[PDB]
Amino acid sequence: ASLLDSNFVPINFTEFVQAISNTYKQRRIQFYENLKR
Amino acid sequence: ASLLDSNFVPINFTEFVQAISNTYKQRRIQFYENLKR
Amino acid sequence: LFDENYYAKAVANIIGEVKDPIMYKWFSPDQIEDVDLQMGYQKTVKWDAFLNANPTTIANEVNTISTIGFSSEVVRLNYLKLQYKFRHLKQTSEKFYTSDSYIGDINNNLLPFAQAYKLASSEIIKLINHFVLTGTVSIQKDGKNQKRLLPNMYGLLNMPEQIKEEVASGDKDKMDKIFEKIEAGLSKLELGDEFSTPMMVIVDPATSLKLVKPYAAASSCEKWEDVLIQTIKAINNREDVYIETSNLLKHKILIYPLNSELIKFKPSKYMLPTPNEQVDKDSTDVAHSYIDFVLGGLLATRKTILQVNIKQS
Amino acid sequence: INNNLLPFAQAYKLASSEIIKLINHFVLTGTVSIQKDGKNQKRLLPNMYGLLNMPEQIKEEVASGDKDKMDKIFEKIEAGLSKLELGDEFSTPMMVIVDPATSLKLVKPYAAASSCEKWEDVLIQTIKAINNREDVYIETSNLLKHKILIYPLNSELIKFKPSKYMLPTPNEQVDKDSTDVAHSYIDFVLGGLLATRKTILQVNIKQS
Amino acid sequence: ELIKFKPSKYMLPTPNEQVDKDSTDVAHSYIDFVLGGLLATRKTILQVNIKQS
Amino acid sequence: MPEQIKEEVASGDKDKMDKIFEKIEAGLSKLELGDEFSTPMMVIVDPATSLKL
Amino acid sequence: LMKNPQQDSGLLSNSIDFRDQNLIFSNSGGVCTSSKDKIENYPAKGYPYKRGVKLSFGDGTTELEVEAGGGDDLYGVCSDIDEFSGMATVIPITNNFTGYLTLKKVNPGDKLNFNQHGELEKVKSVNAIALSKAHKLTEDLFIVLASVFGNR
Amino acid sequence: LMKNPQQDSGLLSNSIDFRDQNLIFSNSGGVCTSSKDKIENYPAKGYPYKRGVKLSFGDGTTELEVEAGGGDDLYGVCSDIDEFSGMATVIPITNNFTGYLTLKKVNPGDKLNFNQHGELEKVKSVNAIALSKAHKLTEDLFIVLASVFGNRAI
Amino acid sequence: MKNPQHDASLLSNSNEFRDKNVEFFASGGTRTSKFDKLENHPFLGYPYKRGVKRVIQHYEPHVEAGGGEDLYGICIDIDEFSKTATIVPITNNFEGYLVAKDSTVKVKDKLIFNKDGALEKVKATINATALTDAKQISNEVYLVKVAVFGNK
DSSP states (O other): OOTTSTTOOOOSHHHHHHHHHHHHHHHHHHHHHHOOO | OOTTOTTOOOOSHHHHHHHHHHHHHHHHHHHHHHOOO | OTTTOHHHHHHHHHGGGSOOOGGGGGSOGGGBOOBOOSSEEEEEEEEEEEEOSOOOOOOSSOOEEEOEEEEEEEEEEEEEEEEEEEEEEOTTTSGGGBOSSOBSBTTTTBOOHHHHHHHHHHHHHHHHHHHHHHSOOOSOTTOOSBOOOOSSOOOTTTOSSSEEEEEOGGGTTOHHHHHHHHHHHHHHOOOGGGOOSOEEEEEOHHHHHHHTSBOOOOOSSOBHHHHHHHHHHHHHTSOOEEEEEOSSOSSEEEEEEOOTTTEEEOOBTTOSOEEEEEEEOOSSSEEEEEEEEEEOOEEEBTTOOEEEEEOOO | OTTOOOOHHHHHHHHHHHHHHHHHHHHHHSOOOSSTTOOSOOOOOTTOOOSSSOSSSEEEEEOGGGTTOHHHHHHHHHHHHHHOOOGGGOSSOEEEEEOHHHHHHTTSEEOOOEEEEEHHHHHHHHHHTTTTSOOEEEEEOTTOSSEEEEEEOOTTTEEEOOOTTOSOEEOSOOBOOSSSOOBOOEEOOOOOEEEOSSOOEEEEEOOO | OOEEEOOOTTOSOEEEEEEEOOSSSOOEEEEEOOOOOEEEBTTOOEEEEEOOO | OOSSEEEEEOGGGTTOHHHHHHHHHHHHHHOOOGGGOSSOOOOOOOHHHHHHO | OOSSOOOOOSSOOOOOOSSSOSOSTTOOSOSSOOTTOOOEEEEBSSOOTTSEEEEEOOSSSSOOEEEEOOGGGEEEEEEEEETTTTEEEEEETTSOEEEEEEEOOOOTTOEEEEOTTSOEEEOOOEEEEEOSOOEEEETTEEEEEEEEEEEO | OOSSOSSOOSSBOOOOOOSSOOOSTTOOSOSSOOTTOOOEEEEEESOOTTEEEEEEOOSSSBOOEEEEOOGGGOOEEEEEEETTTTEEEEEETTSOEEEEEEEOOOOTTOEEEEOTTSOEEEOOOSOEEEOSOOEEEETTEEEEEEEEOSOOOO | OOOGGGGBSSBOOOSOOSSOOOSTTOOSOSEEETTOOOEEEEBSSOOTTSEEEEEOOOOOOEEEEOOGGGOOEEEEEEETTTTEEEEEETTSOEEEEEEESSSOOOTTOBEEEOTTSOEEEOOOSEEEEEOSOOEEEETTEEEEEEEEEEEO
């Protein structure tokens, strides 16, 4: 579950926090993919 | 694997010690079965 | 949830605009691993051996022989939870505070929840980046009045048992002297068998300005930056060398390898700012919200970081 | 963990690694010591020499005041290379071993500074001037300290005849008792370097 | 529930593998045992001592 | 075992079974078995007490 | 003499650093605040912002007000001002406070007291402890982080 | 010198009676607690648990801490300690408190004051009233139920 | 206590093999013979790497740090869980690192165990010879390599 997919529907604040963490990790991965030294 | 079983053939000292412990446990159970308060 | 919690909905709709932390550039993708823990510690056990004396010569009869000793070391990484509070306007009251081209009271500096959360998250990310870089938490340019952190919580700049060199106050303008100190530190570095790895250098703006001058009559083709890259390649086995400039540093140079076997960052999965469920509500139009974040989780091997400090006295 | 006790396999692996490091130190330097200072040396038998302490070779000493002068270092190196005597086996590849400080010094532009050429290239050409333009190899070892070692890779001049039991080997005897702690023994053999006279160049850059 | 004995499975005597041997007819052997493991709740044991002073 | 009921019978009454049994009654009253009371009981005595019993 | 004066500018100003950014006169409230703090509002006479306040009584025609003062008359501490309504936010002396207050024109650990004009000065009754050194905002404006925790 | 008993108990506690089961050093907080109480936390300097605390300053490199003390420097009372983070829970002296506190090595109604080590002693500057008699936990440790309400005049 | 490396803040580097054995966790001796007599005793205090004495009081006698005319042996290892100390009796020679009083101990100096079980420069009671200089590990901890070979 991540906030990048709009189809995600959080049931409670716990799932919302988990989604925030997953979104942060996914953005980290995407940044490293798009990074070119 | 207990020393009561004559067919038991230990391979090493660890198995022998385990058999001794199992023999003690079985003897305790047998004594409790035989005891009549 | 989003049909009941306007604040959660706003956080979900605003979290995209928050920029990525810049500390990611200082690490390789394989050097960062998440851990599921808010506050507490993690332990790692390493075994080692040592020689107690010279070897014993076996001749004729002897039974007193030198011994080889063994040791175990437990490295503990501490993770700490921290929180901030901020004030904002209430959603029901935002309409009475909307304006022609903005929402919020300029006179009292009251903001909508989304904007307030975004700005607070940006500030907290800046603080987290500063902590990761320097190993200290403070809001003063002097660097005093630091928050007391738990032991075994260090940054790249204050990690103990690393190579540290000091350029004298009278030689701060001499790039050759600075490079001499850097070369001494590079020589004293001990990468072991994991030497073949890309290297990362972080420099201050003044050092970056000094680096572009021609190498010393002065050379007409090569610069101090090129000389430094060649010197670092000599020790990393001609691997890639990356150079970064950070305004956070002040007259300090950091050199370290981008190898997960020597330096590893295991941050908490909740390290970055996260909203708290509790919201303070009164009869007025002002509400309060809380943001949580977790600090800690840098692990490094001994004698693998070069830290050069230029005295400005 | 609380008593620093490991299984036999891990203990043997660690001890073998340590002993191999000691053997490498002895082979490179010719001395046996566990101190960084190099003191408290074990007394060894005669005719047991390493590459650095082999007698009747070429020795050059760079003065303390010129420790940073690569030109002076190269002057001494050229003098030693001239004093080398390879005889009829001169057409052979050469090997150079340097300390990390010297290795870092060797990558500087050749000295005003000259582009497209470095001190490493100058040294390679200088050695090629004597080895009949053969291969020249360069190695860096942290065991050395302000030392430069140059020698040919020809078996007719330098030969290493180690014992077949030189590397660590377990011993049959194992101490046992009523407790859970046992003791084991590891053996190794040192010695066996032979070199013809005046074929090794040893340059020592003095600091003090 | 109130009093429970959880002894080690090696509590009773067990021979040890090590045997001391010499050039004489006397050898030495070792026996191991484990002690401990009684658990009781508070105020569930009555102990009466008759002083013999 | 600590935190258990202890009673002491005086030296002058070491031969008075009535005094000993009164001390036993006091200890039995102070015992606290809770809801696990429906359980068998065990009494261990020395030969002199067995003779007096 | 204004908490947040409004003035247009022809240029943006870059926030280069995130440190030492809260040392401004417009920083209202307390540095560290609890949700159970008791807060009141009174009509303001003068400009008692960032100053200790005392109750002032008129001729009975209008309700009592608050004015900058200290000594034995100290009633509370003013932490915010709404200029449109002329309202002063007051934290009572019975409730502890931590924040920046106006200092008389001083090192951590020094014990402070309120003067006749509601300014902090180095020493009798008020429990004021300086948590930092003086910071000069204007030629006549000095602020200091202080902890007010009752009376001795 | 620890909030929880350092020595692991050798038996199972008997949960039968409900009376006189709160006279322990592990009873953190207060007997009567209000939801509107103001609570802070501070870096602990020493072990100020169940003791009056004062603010301590250093060179200025690190933030101020709290240490056991009293007299004219009293700032609050420490009612809980998190040992992992070295955090002391502080109730400000401006907020009244009722709970068990350490007593210097006393009958209900006696007026008490805090000494230099944060210990209560029988009487001047702080209003503290003992609501019970001293209970001995360790041979050198006694606790007393007390209500602390602000600072008195003179 | 005995193992101060369990609170390490960073991983150690194991590439070097020189100057790697002078540590407080190096229990035992530098050179050990199979026929060395070892006795395990209960202890009170911290007798690790110190001379020990027998204390008799009811429980069995225990050992604790001591020296002089009451010296009984040398403690070389401790099991903390069982609170037991392994001791080499004074009738058996020993070579290893032991706790010294101060840093003024040099090579070839004759040493004596003090009342605290620490080795100090000097008749004497036992023959103990320092083989290396005193080496500091903690702010108050010095270890010295000493060969103990009986009594005078």
